[PDB]
Amino acid sequence: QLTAAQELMIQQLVAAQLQCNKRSFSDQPKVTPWPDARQQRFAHFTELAIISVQEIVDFAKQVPGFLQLGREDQIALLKASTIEIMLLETARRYNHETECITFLKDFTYSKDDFHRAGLQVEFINPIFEFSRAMRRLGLDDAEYALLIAINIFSADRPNVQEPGRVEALQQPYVEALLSYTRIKRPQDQLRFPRMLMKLVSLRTLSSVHSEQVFALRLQDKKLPPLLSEIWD
Amino acid sequence: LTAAQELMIQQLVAAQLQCNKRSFSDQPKVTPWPLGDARQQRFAHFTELAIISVQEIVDFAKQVPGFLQLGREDQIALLKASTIEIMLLETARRYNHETECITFLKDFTYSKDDFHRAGLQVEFINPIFEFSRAMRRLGLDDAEYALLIAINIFSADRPNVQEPGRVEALQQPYVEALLSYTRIKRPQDQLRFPRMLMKLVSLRTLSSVHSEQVFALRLQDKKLPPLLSEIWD
Numbered sequence: 001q002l003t004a005a006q007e008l009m010i011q012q013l014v015a016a017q018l019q020c021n022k023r024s025f026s027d028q029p030k031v032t033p034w035p036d037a038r039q040q041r042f043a044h045f046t047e048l049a050i051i052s053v054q055e056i057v058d059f060a061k062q063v064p065g066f067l068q069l070g071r072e073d074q075i076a077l078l079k080a081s082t083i084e085i086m087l088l089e090t091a092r093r094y095n096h097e098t099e100c101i102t103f104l105k106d107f108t109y110s111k112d113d114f115h116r117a118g119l120q121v122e123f124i125n126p127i128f129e130f131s132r133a134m135r136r137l138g139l140d141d142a143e144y145a146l147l148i149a150i151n152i153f154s155a156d157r158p159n160v161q162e163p164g165r166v167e168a169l170q171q172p173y174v175e176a177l178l179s180y181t182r183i184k185r186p187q188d189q190l191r192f193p194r195m196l197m198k199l200v201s202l203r204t205l206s207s208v209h210s211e212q213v214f215a216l217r218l219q220d221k222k223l224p225p226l227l228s229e230i231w232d
Numbered sequence: 233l234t235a236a237q238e239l240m241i242q243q244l245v246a247a248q249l250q251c252n253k254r255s256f257s258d259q260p261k262v263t264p265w266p267l268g269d270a271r272q273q274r275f276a277h278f279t280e281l282a283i284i285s286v287q288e289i290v291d292f293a294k295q296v297p298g299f300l301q302l303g304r305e306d307q308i309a310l311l312k313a314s315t316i317e318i319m320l321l322e323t324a325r326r327y328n329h330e331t332e333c334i335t336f337l338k339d340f341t342y343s344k345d346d347f348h349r350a351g352l353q354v355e356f357i358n359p360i361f362e363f364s365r366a367m368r369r370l371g372l373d374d375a376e377y378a379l380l381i382a383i384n385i386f387s388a389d390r391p392n393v394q395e396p397g398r399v400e401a402l403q404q405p406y407v408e409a410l411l412s413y414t415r416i417k418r419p420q421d422q423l424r425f426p427r428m429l430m431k432l433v434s435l436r437t438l439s440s441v442h443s444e445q446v447f448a449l450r451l452q453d454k455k456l457p458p459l460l461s462e463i464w465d
């Protein structure tokens with residue numbers, strides 16, 4: 001069984017995830033209309049990304065352990081994990097039958113909509129393949145939330161000053177997920193390793209994203225201030 | 233372990249040892265290391281160590297059960313991606329914590345400065361030695377190393393794989409076997425096994441860092457030999 005402390009930890013992540021979701025409804029009426037129209041579609045997409053950044057930041061603050069780290073390590077961990085979490089949340093919003101992604105409650109986007117918004121096929125196709133691979137895993141809410149917490153506290157991120165501390169904070173989340181997947185699905189021993197394998201996939205996708213932001217340079221496209229401070 | 237799992241592990245361990253025995257034999261074949269125009273000779277020496285490692289990885293993979301049942305194009309594609317990663321996994325294995333040096337082939341030892349003298353960037357060398365010392369903390373033996381490499385080989389998300397579903401299904405028994413082996417080795421250290429898989433996560437970053445190292449060289453117009461050029465640019 002999960003202990004009282006572990007359940008408290010899990011319920012906190014699940015509940016914080018859901019409250020950050022209710023802060024999608026607040027932003028939706030204030031977003032650039034989807035159509036010079038090409039730049040408006042890029043802006044539209046960058047604003048979605050910024051809504052997601054705000055959500056991620058506000059989630060991290062709620063994750064027990066995060067505010068125990070120094071400010072620089074808080075920044076260093078969020079800078080790396082932001083794209084990985086975005087893609088994870090993107091995968092969760094994917095509809096297998098329509099093959100669209102649904103952002104901010106409604107607003108559905110196809111592969112071609114991603115393209116119309118200025119993104120390249122070298123980046124788009126891995127996103128949709130990762131989206132498809134994630135649906136197949138069929139992660140529940142506690143699984144999703146715990147994977148994100150584990151993702152956040154990765155010690156090998158660039159510019160981490162206290163990787164020993166970061167590694168120690170990840171431990172209880174690794175342990176809770178191990179205990180959870182043992183109780184939830186006793187007859188699937190490989191669920192937990194399979195979940196961790198997706199972090200490997202996410203590192204590759206992050207590298208693919210860096211290439212994509214580099215390609216914006218020559219396309220006469222610029223990241224807005226808040227995205228630029230993380231990705232430029 | 234089951235009879236099937238233990239035979240598997242023995243197969244991998246014996247392939248790994250036949251690979252290492254060939255590493256030993258190759259020492260007198262290698263261009264000497266020139267001491268303190270002679271940059272180029274150090275770079276070719278290192279280049280030769282990697283060529284040796286490439287064909288050793290090719291030979292190991294053919295011994296990994298199931299790998300020859302994949303189409304040849306996927307075999308090629310799997311190896312093209314994971315070679316850099318298997319090299320570093322092997323580098324880490326030969327890292328000496330006392331001396332802060334790595335032992336290639338039989339007794340050729342190289343420090344951080346030696347890596348820089350052979351023509352590699354600090355951006356790349358630093359992480360190699362950090363991963364090596366990270367690897368030493370988990371205290372992996374021969375079976376665990378051999379299993380992690382086989383797991384590394386069968387990653388379904390590599391570029392240009394035609395049957396990723398088949399690749400993911402061949403990775404399964406290897407993951408299985410490591411989980412059982414690590415639960416039998418340290419029954420009280422649950423978190424050793426997840427930490428080993430996070431190493432594959434670290435290896436993906438390391439791979440991108442290597443693509444930059446190769447890119448930096450293209451910018452200085454200093455070339456890789458055919459075999460490494462084929463795989464890396």
Ligand SMILES: CS(=O)(=O)c1cccc(Oc2cccc(-c3ccnc4c(C(F)(F)F)cccc34)c2)c1
Pocket residue numbers: 024042045046048049050051052055086087089090093102103104105119209212213216223231
């Ligand atoms: C809107 S939401 O429902 O809150 C949500 C949910 C999940 C993810 C999400 O963020 C998005 C949505 C669409 C695109 C991007 C995005 C990711 C990475 N790069 C981008 C870039 C660039 F850097 F140039 F490559 C430009 C424009 C958008 C992006 C992020 C929003």
Ligand SMILES: CS(=O)(=O)c1cccc(Oc2cccc(-c3ccnc4c(C(F)(F)F)cccc34)c2)c1
Pocket residue numbers: 255275278279281282284285288319320322323335336337338352442445446449456460464
């Ligand atoms: C010698 S051995 O015992 O067979 C052995 C053991 C373990 C690993 C191994 O492979 C090596 C050894 C030394 C260097 C490299 C290497 C890796 C990546 N890039 C390289 C590059 C470049 F591309 F320019 F960046 C140039 C030269 C060498 C390398 C690989 C060999």
